[PDB]
Design a protein around this nucleic acid. Structure first.
Ligand SMILES: [Mg+2]
Ligand SMILES: [Mg+2]
Ligand SMILES: [Mg+2]
Lengths: 456, 44
RNA sequence: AUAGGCGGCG
């Protein structure tokens, strides 16, 4: 009825934003933070998104409040997202006259001079608006968000807004491939473009600095960190990426300072907690190296405090975002480090049921579970099961290569207890095949086949 | 031993990768009920 | 969206 009119509207309700129930507390928290701390030109988008999240929570009057706040801030065409959200709001509540009121407002603006004249309207602004909503709703929406901004840059290649959106989506997709071999810095030129056209935007400067750092250009990146830190623009966000920059440079204490300052503004940020975990992890590794694995007295004291601190923050991260895979894995591994194998295991079992956006993250999950099964749980069969499972995920990566090598070591261990084993001989043949060592691959497979026929 | 012999033929021609595939098919079958899961990886 | 210590007859 009116419902087919609603389905033509370009707004949050029709954009199929991929939002697990599990990610909802976290998303709302990130929406509130952005509203308070992100320096942008139009804050209408994020309140429209706050509205949608309230609506998914079952709090429609709060959702209405957020739409009224967005309206009170409202080019004018971006109001259309607000109005379409209003239309859906009033529908879902059951104010069919009020919904219709707002549909009619959308239609009247859609007659200057829109092609689908009815409720959809095609302009750069609503494209960007779909981009940013997708870009805030988690990694699975990122290819789509990139395409939205890219659509607009196909037409207007010097659009400052969509150049930003495009460059941030790209940097984050680049992020997913840092673990793959033969990753290319696809976001480096877009970020340079984006900084040129949004010269005041510190958020974009710090990601550029991080990309520069990944490509070995530390000096140039550090200038962007120092610049970004000297401007108000998005102080709290600049703090997070500046901290990441200094940690990867090896100024861990400087990182902590920034992260802890940022935690006052945004206590809830799983990014912060995770990254603060990584600072403590890196300090644990420093002490372990300087004391040759045998810390005593005060050193042991400090190592223990840092293991507790990392666990505290990785725990704080996954409580707030249960689907935060990498944070679960780091927690599993901190638990191993602390001697808590059940806690390790428990985090490993939750990891085994996840569908990561980043396929390589499942390789890491199996690799590290397999090592947990070899060295902590003393179960070779499960090590092998899981090293094989990591190997089976096709993607070339350092971690897959690690799994091949871990399988090799374990099977050569087994063959030196018991050389006449059909599985072990076939496994070692397999490993050699995955190394590209084909003479040996065939030699071990042949031995296994000849072992079979001799046994019969 | 049909798959062994198919392997040797590829090996003797230089198709090391088809040689591996042939042997895998037979070693898969032998190891289909192996606890590691290697038998299934071979029969894919 | 928040990556890379060393990896086992160590
Ligand atoms: Mg998050
Ligand atoms: Mg890191
Ligand atoms: Mg990590």
């Amino acid at each position: 009825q009116v419902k087919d009119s609603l389905e033509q509207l370009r707004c949050h309700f029709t954009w199929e934003l991929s939002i697990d129930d599990d990610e909802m507390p976290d998303l709302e928290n990130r929406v509130l933070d952005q509203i308070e701390f992100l320096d942008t030109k139009y804050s209408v988008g994020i309140h429209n998104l706050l509205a949608y999240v309230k609506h998914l929570k079952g709090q429609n009057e709060e959702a209405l409040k957020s739409l009224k706040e967005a309206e009170n801030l409202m080019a004018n065409v971006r109001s259309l997202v607000t109005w379409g959200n209003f239309a859906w709001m009033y529908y879902h509540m059951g104010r069919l006259a009020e919904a219709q009121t707002y549909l009619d407002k959308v239609e009247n603006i859609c007659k200057k001079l829109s092609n689908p004249f009815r409720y959809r309207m095609e302009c750069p602004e609503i494209d960007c608006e779909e981009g940013w909503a997708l870009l805030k709703c988690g990694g699975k929406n990122y290819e789509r968000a990139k395409a939205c901004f890219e659509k607009v840059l196909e037409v207007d290649p010097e659009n400052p807004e969509s150049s930003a959106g495009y460059a941030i989506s790209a940097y984050r997709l680049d992020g997913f491939k840092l673990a793959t071999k033969n990753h290319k810095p696809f976001s480096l030129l877009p970020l340079r473009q984006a900084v040129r056209l949004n010269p005041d935007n510190g958020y974009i400067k710090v990601l550029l600095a991080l990309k520069l750092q990944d490509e070995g250009q530390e000096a140039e990146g550090e200038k962007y960190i120092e610049e970004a830190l000297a401007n108000m623009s998005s102080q709290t966000y600049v703090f997070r990426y500046a901290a990441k920059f200094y940690r990867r440079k090896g100024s861990v204490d400087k990182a902590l300072e920034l992260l802890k300052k940022a935690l006052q503004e945004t206590p809830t940020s799983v990014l912060l907690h995770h990254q603060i975990g990584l600072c403590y992890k890196a300090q644990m590794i420093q002490i372990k190296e300087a004391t040759k694995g045998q810390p005593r007295g005060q050193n042991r004291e400090k190592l223990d405090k840092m293991i507790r601190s990392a666990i505290f923050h990785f725990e704080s991260a996954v409580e707030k975002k249960p689907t935060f895979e990498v944070a679960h894995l780091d927690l599993a591994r901190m638990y191993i480090e602390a001697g808590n194998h059940r806690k390790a295991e428990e985090n490993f079992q939750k990891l085994l049921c996840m569908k990561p956006v980043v396929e390589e993250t499942m390789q890491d999950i199996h690799f590290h579970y397999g090592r947990f099964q070899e060295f902590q749980k003393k179960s070779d069969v499960n090590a092998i099961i899981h090293y094989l499972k990591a190997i089976k995920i096709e993607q070339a990566s350092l971690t897959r290569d690690k799994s091949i090598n871990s399988l090799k070591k374990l099977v050569l261990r087994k063959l030196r207890r018991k050389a006449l084993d059909l599985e072990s001989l076939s496994l070692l043949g397999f490993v050699y095949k995955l190394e590209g060592n084909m003479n040996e691959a065939l030699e071990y497979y042949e031995r296994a086949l000849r072992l079979a026929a001799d046994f019969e | 031993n049909y798959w062994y012999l198919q392997g040797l033929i590829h090996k003797q021609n230089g198709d090391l990768l088809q040689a591996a595939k042939c042997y895998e098919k037979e070693l898969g079958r032998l190891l289909r009920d192996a606890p590691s899961g290697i038998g299934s990886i071979f029969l894919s």
